[PDB]
Design a protein around this ligand. Sequence first.
Ligand SMILES: Nc1ncnc2c1ncn2[C@@H]1O[C@H](COP(=O)(O)OP(=O)(O)OP(=O)(O)O)[C@@H](O)[C@H]1O
Ligand SMILES: Nc1ncnc2c1ncn2[C@@H]1O[C@H](COP(=O)(O)OP(=O)(O)OP(=O)(O)O)[C@@H](O)[C@H]1O
Ligand SMILES: Nc1ncnc2c1ncn2[C@@H]1O[C@H](COP(=O)(O)OP(=O)(O)OP(=O)(O)O)[C@@H](O)[C@H]1O
Ligand SMILES: [Mg+2]
Lengths: 51, 393, 390, 247, 70
Amino acid sequence: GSSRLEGGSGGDSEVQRTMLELLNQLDGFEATKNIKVIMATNRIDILDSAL
Amino acid sequence: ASKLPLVTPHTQCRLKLLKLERIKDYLLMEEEFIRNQEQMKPLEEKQEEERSKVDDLRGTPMSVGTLEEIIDDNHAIVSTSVGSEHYVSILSFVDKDLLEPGCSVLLNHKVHAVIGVLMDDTDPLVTVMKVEKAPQETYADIGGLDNQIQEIKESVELPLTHPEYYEEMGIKPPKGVILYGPPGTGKTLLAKAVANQTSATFLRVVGSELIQKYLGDGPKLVRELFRVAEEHAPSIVFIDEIDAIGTKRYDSNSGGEREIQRTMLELLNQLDGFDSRGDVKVIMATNRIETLDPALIRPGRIDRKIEFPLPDEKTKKRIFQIHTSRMTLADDVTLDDLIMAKDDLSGADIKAICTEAGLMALRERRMKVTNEDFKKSKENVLYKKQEGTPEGL
Amino acid sequence: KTYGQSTYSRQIKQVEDDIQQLLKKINELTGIKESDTGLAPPALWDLAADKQTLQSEQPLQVARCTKIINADSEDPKYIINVKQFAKFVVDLSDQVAPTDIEEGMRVGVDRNKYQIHIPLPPKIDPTVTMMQVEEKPDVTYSDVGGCKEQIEKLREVVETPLLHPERFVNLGIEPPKGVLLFGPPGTGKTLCARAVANRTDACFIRVIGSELVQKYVGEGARMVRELFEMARTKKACLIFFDEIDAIGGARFDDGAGGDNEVQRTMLELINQLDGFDPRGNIKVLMATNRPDTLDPALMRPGRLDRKIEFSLPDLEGRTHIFKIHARSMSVERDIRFELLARLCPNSTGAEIRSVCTEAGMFAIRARRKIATEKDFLEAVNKVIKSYAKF
Amino acid sequence: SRRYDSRTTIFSPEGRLYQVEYAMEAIGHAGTCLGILANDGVLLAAERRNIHKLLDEVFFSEKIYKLNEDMACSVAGITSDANVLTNELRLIAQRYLLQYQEPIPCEQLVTALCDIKQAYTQFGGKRPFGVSLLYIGWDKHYGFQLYQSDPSGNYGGWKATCIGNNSAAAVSMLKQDYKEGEMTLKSALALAIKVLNKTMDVSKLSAEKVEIATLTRENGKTVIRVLKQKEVEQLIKKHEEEEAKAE
Amino acid sequence: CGKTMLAKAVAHHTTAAFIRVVGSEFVQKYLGEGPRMVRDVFRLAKENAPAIIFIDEIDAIATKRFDAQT
Ligand SMILES: Nc1ncnc2c1ncn2[C@@H]1O[C@H](COP(=O)(O)OP(=O)(O)OP(=O)(O)O)[C@@H](O)[C@H]1O
Ligand SMILES: Nc1ncnc2c1ncn2[C@@H]1O[C@H](COP(=O)(O)OP(=O)(O)OP(=O)(O)O)[C@@H](O)[C@H]1O
Ligand SMILES: Nc1ncnc2c1ncn2[C@@H]1O[C@H](COP(=O)(O)OP(=O)(O)OP(=O)(O)O)[C@@H](O)[C@H]1O
Ligand SMILES: [Mg+2]
């Protein structure tokens, strides 16, 4: 990721389709589900803000 | 279903009634005659076996090609998958309303004559920009604006609800509304609300998301954004943080700023240019507006411009009770004591205060939030002000 | 219920509702189930279930598109290049005469002996065919007011020479072929262009400057070249570049390269306009808010021969514009439109149309159906005064 | 030449002097400074940044400066601009003394220097002085005093202040733990040791990464002193002992 | 500093089978041919139990940055 329209693809890049599916899944379930998604990065700033 | 237009005054009238009664009465005669025929003969067998003749003409191994140019005369140039280019004849059963260049056409195997078309994906960009219902809340969660919300409702919602008002007098709605004001004051929220409340396809974009790292991609993005908005009936576009893209347009600049200016020209043309914009509205936001380009926010492009002041004394009480709404609070919460101070608090600041107080209440295990916690949180949030005190005053 | 919109509201509502019901009932009673295979209404499987499809599949064979590359000897012998299939040396079937075929034109050939049967129109980038106007706008020369000399010049350069060539040809004047329209934002450039497009009687093309920047090197120049070739196929055409400042930027190359491809496309446009290859019957217009940035080679006569200045309208034009836009309104009878023209100091056409619409608004919000003076005074206040600081 | 001019003395489009703002931004990184006015003394507590095993000990101090017999000041910002301003302050004091044969009152002095600084940020085309001052002194008009200055030219009397690194935090505790009019010199020194121990988050007071000053009246005349190592370390031991007993 | 010398020597002395390639060779015109060559090479190596595969100038392939749009 790092953005949803980055290389002019129009949201059809695979790197962006994976991020879209991850966002849909994260919004799928409720806070009260004892399912916490821990995410890691060695470079915070590049990291996308839509997460 | 492809019915006639009354084209009487179009406003409640006696002529609209008689042209309307007439179509109804003809539909009634047609329905009666049809029902009579159906009872007299099903015709199910006759209507069937036409499917059989068609399927006979279209052989089993139908081939998915890609139409590339219709000669306007029941002929076509259809490209097979490999890349070859054939010049075939369009038959009589293909719904020609569905034939445009680039459509996945269904050709015959031995003769490649066009015999059908297929649907395509709906997500060139539709999914990525449309916001659906706002998870935050409806118009209930917004208070203190009253006048501003009324303006937006009249600008974007009222022309959809009851067109008769505008239509009666011959005036078209305003074109676009630009929301401007100090940061944290309710622009994006009000746009979200008028989105989740209306009945069109609302699309959202960030200005920094139009700054592209290949040449001629920003203009393509804006052109598409305004291209899939007429494909979708009434539509709204909200380009937030436009300041990052529309700036004063100083000429003494070098680098990628030229591309910024070129995308700005593309937008400036889309909003009001040579062609008719169809049925779409444009909302915009900018924390800093003194720096926009005169041609972007000029009258025919953006008619309505809305200022957004901070909460003064009482909207603060409203917002506070809005965000403290869902939390168990101790019975010593001197909310006014937190509001009375003329600290120039902003709406986002109020949300920050609520969240920080709730979080420290969680930290201390305490089942309830106390006034002392809220005041401590207020001090902590305001701690993010800084600047040079005597300087400037 | 509500306050009551109209006396017939409920009656029309009822007739609409039962119209919808009768339409749905006939829909169910006729079938017409949507088909995922793109197949026409069964009443329109017509000549399609049979009797033309079965008669078109027999005599109309499949020709294959091929691009002629050479026509050697006087004797017909044609080298065609079938795309991604092969490259042959074929002859002419009897239907085509030798004069019809030229080098470089797409041709159709059969699947057995590959002999030429039909020519075909050239291939044009999909992004270069849409810039044709197709449906012309309805704005006309009565809708543009307060600009009388400017419109005269534009009409004498883009419009009159095509309609009546003999005036100019007799005296021996080749009329100017370019116009640069420049003036404050919202003064009447694009509207006069719309009017010119509506009135003219020849091909019209709309090119945005921001439409000629492209990602891949050497594409914009190709786009311009194709556009001018296309416009030159027609009998006469007008091209109306908007925001030409988009790609007419001044040349300042120094140190690290910056905006150079745009410069190559700009040079290609320059050479197309006035250059070794004659420019046929084409007339060009350009509009800019900032004409200074345009380079020294473009702004030169031979390319942009005229320069029409659009200035903010005078008082007479101010009232005229007010009156044009206040036409299709349900407005009061006597409005001292001179008073309204005075009350707004120097202001452009967009100001005035905004004034008209804001007056309509202040009429609506008061739940009135006829616009009065007080509506227009409130409109002028809310437009000029309140939106001054922007 | 206008091409190379920087325009260090011109307004921005919101009426804020940018060179001044950056000057104040430089101070927020130099050593912290502390002011505490007691009822029987004044005291400056800045941090000794020149912390290396290979530096030599010279002069009676390293950040505190005497200006008259009855006045001293400490600096945060650039060292060289500090020296220039200190020299001009000394000259001002002696010029007043020569004209009136009386020691220069404290606000006499602080406003003379700040007037130089303000003028410097008003016209001339130079960069402004990137220094913020803390002063201390006594005069027959207002007794023990504690002033402060900034690159703009503004000053202020402070019962307790902090100019320099971690200024927000230091002033926050100073607000929480200042008894207006209920402070002895000893208590003020202890409060200083505590606040600085917070602020100098790097390690703890090493008794060597700190500077302390005291201005008092003794035998009818002012006496200025810079705390030695033994007393400073003893104070720190007392501070740790008090905190330990507290816990 | 001797990168292709040592590989050359260990190809002289060693008893196992040796396959040498340059990363600029895998890249080919048609689609599915680069992968096919990679798979073929590794499969031939797997066929001969003792074997060394040398891919000189791997920079032609394993470059980090990509532009997956062309
Ligand atoms: N009157 C209000 N009613 C409800 N929420 C408010 C109000 N004013 C501010 N907020 C809060 O402000 C938060 C910030 O979002 P909002 O859409 O208001 O930002 P904004 O004003 O568009 O900000 P920016 O200027 O940075 O674009 C919203 O989550 C909402 O909680
Ligand atoms: N003389 C005029 N008569 C009538 N309407 C006018 C006149 N001048 C401007 N307008 C109105 O101004 C609106 C703005 O579009 P217009 O074509 O005038 O802009 P423009 O001058 O080309 O602006 P830009 O410099 O931004 O491209 C037009 O829709 C028209 O309604
Ligand atoms: N230790 C050495 N003894 C003898 N010759 C050596 C030695 N190191 C390097 N050379 C010389 O190296 C030359 C060949 O260089 P080599 O092919 O090893 O370069 P490389 O490091 O692989 O280069 P590149 O990074 O450009 O691929 C031979 O001529 C050999 O003389
Ligand atoms: Mg905002």
